Amino acid sequence: KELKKSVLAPVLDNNPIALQVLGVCSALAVTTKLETAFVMTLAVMFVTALSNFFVSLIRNHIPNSVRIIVQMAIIASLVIVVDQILKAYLYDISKQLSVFVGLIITNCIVMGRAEAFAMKSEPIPSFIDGIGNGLGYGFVLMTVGFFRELLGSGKLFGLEVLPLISNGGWYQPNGLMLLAPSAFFLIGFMIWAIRTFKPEQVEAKE
Amino acid sequence: GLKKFLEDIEHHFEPGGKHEKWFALYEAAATLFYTPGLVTKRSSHVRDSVDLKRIMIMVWLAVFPAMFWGMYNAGGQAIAALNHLYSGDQLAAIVAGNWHYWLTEMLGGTMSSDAGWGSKMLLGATYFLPIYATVFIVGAFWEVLFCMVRKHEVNEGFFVTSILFALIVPPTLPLWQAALGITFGVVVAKEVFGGTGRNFLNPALAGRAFLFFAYPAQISGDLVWTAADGYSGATALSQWAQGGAGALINNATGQTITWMDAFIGNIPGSIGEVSTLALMIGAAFIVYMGIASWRIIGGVMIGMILLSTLFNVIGSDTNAMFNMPWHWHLVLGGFAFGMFFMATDPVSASFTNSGKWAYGILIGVMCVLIRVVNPAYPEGMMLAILFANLFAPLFDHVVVERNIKRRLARYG
Amino acid sequence: MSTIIFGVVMFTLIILALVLVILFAKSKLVPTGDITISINGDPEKAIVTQPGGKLLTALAGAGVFVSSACGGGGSCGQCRVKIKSGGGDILPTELDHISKGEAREGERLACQVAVKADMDLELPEEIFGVKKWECTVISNDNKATFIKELKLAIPDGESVPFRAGGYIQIEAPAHHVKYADFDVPEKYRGDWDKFNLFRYESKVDEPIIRAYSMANYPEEFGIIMLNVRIATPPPNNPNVPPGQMSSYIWSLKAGDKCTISGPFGEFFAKDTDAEMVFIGGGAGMAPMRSHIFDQLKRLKSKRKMSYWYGARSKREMFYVEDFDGLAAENDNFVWHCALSDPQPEDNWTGYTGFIHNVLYENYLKDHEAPEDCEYYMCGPPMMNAAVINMLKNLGVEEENILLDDFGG
Amino acid sequence: MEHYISLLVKSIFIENMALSFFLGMCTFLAVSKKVKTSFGLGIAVIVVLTISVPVNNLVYNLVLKPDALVEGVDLSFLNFITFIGVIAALVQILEMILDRFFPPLYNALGIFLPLITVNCAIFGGVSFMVQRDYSFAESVVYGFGSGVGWMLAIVALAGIREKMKYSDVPPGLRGLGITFITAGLMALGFMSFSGVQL
Amino acid sequence: DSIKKTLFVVIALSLVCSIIVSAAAVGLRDKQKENAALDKQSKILQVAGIEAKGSKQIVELFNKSIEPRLVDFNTGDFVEGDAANYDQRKAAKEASESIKLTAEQDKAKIQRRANVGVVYLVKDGDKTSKVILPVHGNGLWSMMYAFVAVETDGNTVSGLTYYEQGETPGLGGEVENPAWRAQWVGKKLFDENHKPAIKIVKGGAPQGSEHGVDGLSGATLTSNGVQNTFDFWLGDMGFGPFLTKVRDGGL
Amino acid sequence: MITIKKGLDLPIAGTPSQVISDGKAIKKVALLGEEYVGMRPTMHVRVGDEVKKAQILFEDKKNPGVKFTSPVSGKVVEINRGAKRVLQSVVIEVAGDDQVTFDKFEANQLASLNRDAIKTQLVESGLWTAFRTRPFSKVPAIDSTSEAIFVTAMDTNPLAAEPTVVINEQSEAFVAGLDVLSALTTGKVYVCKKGTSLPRSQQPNVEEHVFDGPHPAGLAGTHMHFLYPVSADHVAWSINYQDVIAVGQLFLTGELYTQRVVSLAGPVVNKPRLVRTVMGASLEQLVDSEIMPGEVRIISGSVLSGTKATGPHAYLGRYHLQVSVLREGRDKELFGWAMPGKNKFSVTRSFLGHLFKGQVYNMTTTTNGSDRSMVPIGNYEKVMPLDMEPTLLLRDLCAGDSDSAVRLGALELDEEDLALCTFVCPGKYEYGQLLRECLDKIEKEG
Ligand SMILES: Cc1cc2nc3c(=O)[nH]c(=O)nc-3n(C[C@H](O)[C@H](O)[C@H](O)COP(=O)(O)OP(=O)(O)OC[C@H]3O[C@@H](n4cnc5c(N)ncnc54)[C@H](O)[C@@H]3O)c2cc1C
Ligand SMILES: Cc1cc2nc3c(=O)[nH]c(=O)nc-3n(C[C@H](O)[C@H](O)[C@H](O)COP(=O)(O)O)c2cc1C
Ligand SMILES: Cc1cc2nc3c(=O)[nH]c(=O)nc-3n(C[C@H](O)[C@H](O)[C@H](O)CO)c2cc1C
């Protein structure tokens, strides 16, 4: 069955962030809470899948001169719809996500997949590729968010897991897990572990 | 016979031996006790006598006066605060409830106001020694782990990192926090880059920054700089930021902090930073020996003086830090410690004579800038050094490019 | 309702305005004019193309193939060309085939070179003499178990101009072949049925091209002959299809029509007084025979020469009569052969073992100055590696080791 | 006058676009191998940002913001499409102008424009401009300062990576992992300006 | 290809995308407005001492229990307008609706004050039981906003909640701690002479004091911010005149 | 005058007395194959062959037309070869006095000779190998020229001989060699010397330049850096004073002149002094009955840069004018690294030794520590006088960044130009081989 390979390879074999360098801004920004990481993962998956589907649908008619304009028009329309829906039904998470909902348009994963696969493949394959890349992105986002939120606030999805001294518990949260360097360090160590368990991705020495 | 024993048990650690996996530790001990006894193979058949062992041991010895005075001062401050707060039965109960205090008393010391220098130094030791031991053991674990896994040889440099980290923390730091800080500093900043001589950040300050930003409540405020139970008291730089020079008063004794007190080290703060005189005495030896960079020190002094005098000339109506002169900037906080022993790390600094001046000037400017125009933090030496570590390579690049142009002009 | 209309109108107007502005800018800024590329400064053989595309396709527009092979990923590196005008800087991936020294004379890979303006070119080796030929198969016999001797005729009394050790390019159309159609004799069928190699088949629906060595010296007029090895799938994953061109060639027979093209070569011999040593294995017999015949029959050179061939058994050796005739007619050449597996029917008494070990133990170890000899080598890569290591441990320099590795 | 100098210093040091807001990280990480390449890319970023932010400010103030065109009508939901289209068209037009009229400026910086035709740094800069409601001069100064800060950060990273030629990184950390760790340490160092109330 | 085809394709794509986007954007605006209002309404209900779960209950209780009103800071008396839709935060930035403060007056470091503010009266039938005052001031890292509930004598605090701040979670973020917020109930804003008297005591306030609350441990620079906020907003330039009118039975 | 301030004069014991005396009888000589950069020999002799003086022994594959000839008449007894059959030395046993002779000219005709005739005579006599080329320190191609030929009439290596004492015996030969070089060159001839006087050539393009200061004030690399900076497109030739005397003798008498004056000195030498020897003389026979008992190392050349003279390599080098002998430092000390060394030398001031000015040390071959990474405490700047960045250049060499090293100035350096940097390294790196590897890469890549 070919579908499983397409949906699963970008998770570990060709991870968009750990092997390719794409979508690092949102990974660094929106991983201080697991709910925001989850919502961003879903939004990116949805936008990438539909952009791939439509671009592959009209791949034979795009004029070469303004292909970028056409692709970005489609992507921006999808992102605008997503942003409106989020503000209509998930107002709190939309507030927390800040400008990074609109930055899905410039997220490198969407444009990279649209150019590389959608322009050369059929609609259903392009949609499945988008879903797979979304899952690969979500893997890193959720893994980073789990550690950051747990070790920084004793919570997961806002649920209390580690009682805090301020509430009469036993755990003192780490303040650095709520700041920028923690995401960098966590992503670096995740890449280290991934390339230890799958050494074929190790880079050659310069 | 130590030599006979060492050269007898050697076969156990060679390949195929009973203890082959501990060869790194065995050789470390062997070359600590005796010298390698090797000879030259090529090029220069004669070599200089200096080596990393001496380079590191001299720096380690340079901080002994500061360490001892820091212990003495911590004990004196703690005793003074305790006698200011409590008396009689309350003081007895407080002493009975703290292992530092009742251990000091058990070993022959006294916690009363008439305590001597011996008792004060003992009380300071019961705070300093546990921190240093924890730091050393925890960091050595990681060093040995990396050396074993990557089949390297344990080298010197952590011998200095551990003590420098231990001397720049408050006397009341928790031991688990100290362990976390040393782990971060050793692993994230140095080991992943290949070890000693292959990193770019300062390992000691990297861990201190980790503590600073992860657990700010235990490394800042009025509750951490004097090891007296229940005592709350501000320090010199905070008091200046609040009310100028007139605000410098020691609440434990009701006396006015003077420039001589700040210079000698009769003030609260980090364990080993307080004594500018002791730090100068220590740094003079290593500057004379050629291990520390007088260019870096001069650059730091130049930047500090220039920016402090510019702020003094500009003046301010609501910020009391604008009128702190250079000679007051010199003796407060960790400026002297950082300038003498942490801004001179050879690996983290610029590798060019011209770049060293810029590096020092940048450190000096940033320290005063953070002290004055940043209200969040009363001090900025650690942050300034960590900041200049990022830009030293660019100074090197500029100097190298000018040299390369000179060469292309057939004048080099 | 009003807001929806306003949004539609504004969206359409903004997008259309941006598109129109960029289109106008492109029409007024990009050249759009034709440009000319000239070769060797001549007013002839020049080409005019649109301001874009690769240099290789512009050259192919005039039939100049620049000895291209595999056409992708810079796999071959044969597409180098020298540029004499103010061209662009080399792409980073040309350094894998072009050295820093070569980069200073204008050497560039035609595959990676893009064009948007006039430029001047200099073609090495005067490849304008290339020709395409229509040929009639003479023989496709099995001289061994996995290599087939192909012989082609040249029409109108012509003869391909080439140097000994050169190679030719073979072009084939779309085809479909099955290994069961091969005419392998019984003496060699014993292994094909042992491994059930008749299971395989291959096909392709667009024409393909390949390069193959030439097994006759220049004055053997009137015929082109080759030795072709059957390309079977790798043994670790034998489920993949076999090779294309070799399988196609193995299906031919006497009287069949075929086309050859692209006679080139870079494996030529040096003209010195030094001794020559030839090491061959498997398919490599062709260039070795070419060099030996060219040196002995045409030039009649008096340099000392020797040939060492590694085999499996007696049923895998060929050109025995030719090499014996050479060694008997002139004493400046000596032929030695070693086979790994002497079967009982072979009645073998000669050298055994691997060819590198045989050569080292019998000839080179006692040689007065092995570094002064010239070594010409062709054959399987895992034999070439061992031979190279053995020669290197004797102090032989790369300048005296000439290698022709089939397939790179 | 002090207002604009404060804005410039804020944009360069205090609110650093790269290390403080995490924008443009894909390119900031990929193109940090050589100092001169990073310098050219940063110059291109400076130019594109300082040209883009003011134009988007003009468009937003004249069309998109509420009651800008007609009373009771607001078209702020077109912000994303308008900004991205403007940036994309303008970058290509400038690249093309440099290619035709200025071959040397093209070789210098124009070769980097394709990377930044669609970039998180520029888009987030415009987005922050929209939220902060800058004037035209404020937009110009903010764009210039953000570009300069991004150039400073990327050039510092390039210098550190060049210094790292002597390092011995574990095989699993070579490249992406060690560069991520270095960037995290750079952010740790840059947190010195956090509390400045400029 | 031809510009004719290019323009046709782009025009059709733009039409489709614009129709979709505009319809989606214009169809959800009312729900977005409701979502925005609900957040503020929940905080006002909380500080008012009213418990509510769900949007339906929040709206139902807010509509009947809370009566927003506009107040003129200069004269401390009510003004006419749509209080339920007034935006004091942007009103403060408009030059035609706000005043520039003086260095001596700007104790809280807000740099501007709107001409008219909004207060939320709490109703028990027709009678009024409490008035909720929005206040804000600069902390160490961010601008801190809070609601303070004051009874009808104009002196006694019923509750306090900070609903927007950006201080460090450990040191300065404790303004949101329920235990610290509970200390404010029962305290008196003014002394017997009607001068501001709220004091943030460093090191802890004495037990039984009617004007002192414990300062934030290790977070003086934020306690100073709170003290400045209250010193400014209880003075002449804040709700001073309004609170004296309330004391005089104006409600 | 040019004055060098950054440098170091090694205070090693055993300074020779600058008086010349007859040396021990030599019965064997050899030519060392590994001391010529990039040389690949082609043998013209075999064991047992008899040879005449100046008869060819082998040629160079990588440098066509260059001939290496015998220094003495005798019989070939050994052809030593190492790993991968690399030639180590060709040993000749002295017997007889047969020689190959060449054309001879009057002293006043040497300045007007033809460049091609001079080159032909030098190549045929084999004296053409005295020259070396910067960059790459290789024997120049016989078809190339250079605008600058650098003559080294000074020596600052520790325990080295005084060139004035040797030159004062061969003034006419030295002047004739200078005239021949002036005729051979296309630009100028630079005679680098100290403040004292030497015989002068009257040709207008021969110039004397005085250098003052410690080591490396006497190195051809420093002289080139200060008088004629070299690069890929600017190549200079280097030759020492004794080879100039040999050239003068060749063009004056038509005979190859193979006499030498070398310094035999070191901590373990009983009577340090200058001794008359022959090119390629056997050092084991030279130092017989001259050394104190014990395990010692015999070095051909200076202790800063030289070749361990053991077994097949136990012969005087082509470019070496001294022999150094010192003990092998295999002792182990109890906490030796922590002692207050009064007898320990160092360019830093961490030992008590520097407090005793004028002290001399009985230095050995021990390495005072183990190998470590580079911690730049600034020792290289104290010893590097050239306009370079020592720390960055050395780190580029360690990392193997050939392009960066070339940009920083590796093309101007020889192995002996980094001897002090190797000496004073706390990490115990050996930068000479790193520089040679970088130069090999650069030359190989064309
Ligand atoms: C100058 C020159 C001279 C040469 N001379 C000769 C010569 O004289 N004789 C000679 O025999 N060769 C020669 N070669 C080699 C020849 O050009 C090819 O390397 C090959 O031998 C041609 O065989 P083919 O066209 O039948 O099969 P190809 O299709 O060229 O070979 C493809 C191979 O890859 C395998 N393969 C295909 N798909 C996959 C897959 N998905 N996964 C794994 N494996 C796969 C196939 O089974 C087969 O083994 C020469 C090459 C050069 C450059
Ligand atoms: C080397 C060194 C660096 C320091 N760096 C900082 C710093 O960056 N920020 C800070 O708040 N305190 C820093 N400190 C701590 C202060 O110097 C001081 O000990 C502490 O803040 C006590 O308050 P005071 O500075 O008002 O005396 C450092 C101390 C040392 C020894
Ligand atoms: C003069 C000198 C100063 C040093 N200062 C420090 C320091 O401040 N912090 C530290 O961790 N190591 C210090 N070291 C040890 C070592 O140089 C440092 O850990 C390197 O960065 C390790 O590569 C110092 C060493 C010397 C010789």
Ligand code: FES
């Ligand atoms: S730059 Fe790639 S996602 Fe932002």
Ligand code: FES
């Ligand atoms: S196909 Fe030959 S180099 Fe590209």
Ligand SMILES: [Ca+2]
């Ligand atoms: Ca207001």
